[PDB]
Design a protein around this ligand. Structure first.
Ligand code: MA4
Lengths: 50, 50
């Protein structure tokens, strides 16, 4: 009797996350008040098995 | 000898992953699937003795 078992397992995984927050607020002496805040998130995952 | 030429259509979803880099610093791999209706014309012939 002869047996040969061969198992191969491969797992790959990548996570990429980017965040940006840009604020700009100008405030005179109780005449003009201007505030602008922008946000940006980017979250990506990728897993590959075999 | 031209036997027959006919066109065949089939819908297939191709999955592809691409690395998009915006501003050369925001690099992310995005995987997208595109459903395309591939169409191909097959022309079958046959060889007779000249
Ligand atoms: O899904 C929608 C279609 O599903 C079937 O057709 C399937 C077909 O039976 C299968 O073999 C392949 O799907 C799998 C896609 C194979 C090509 C991409 C492979 C990727 C895998 C990851 C690494 C890169 C290559 O095509 C289409 C999918 O539209 C039928 O035609 C019908 O139900 C419909 O039109």
């Amino acid at each position: 009797q002869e047996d040969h078992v061969r198992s191969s397992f491969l797992l790959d995984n990548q996570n990429s996350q980017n965040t940006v927050t840009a604020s700009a607020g100008i405030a005179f002496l109780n005449i003009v008040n201007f505030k602008v805040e922008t946000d940006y998130i980017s979250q990506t995952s990728l897993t590959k098995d075999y | 000898v031209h036997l027959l030429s006919q066109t065949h259509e089939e819908g297939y979803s191709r999955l592809e992953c691409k690395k998009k880099c915006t501003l050369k610093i925001f690099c992310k791999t995005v995987c997208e699937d595109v459903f395309r209706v591939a169409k191909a014309e097959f022309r079958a012939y046959w060889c007779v003795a000249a």
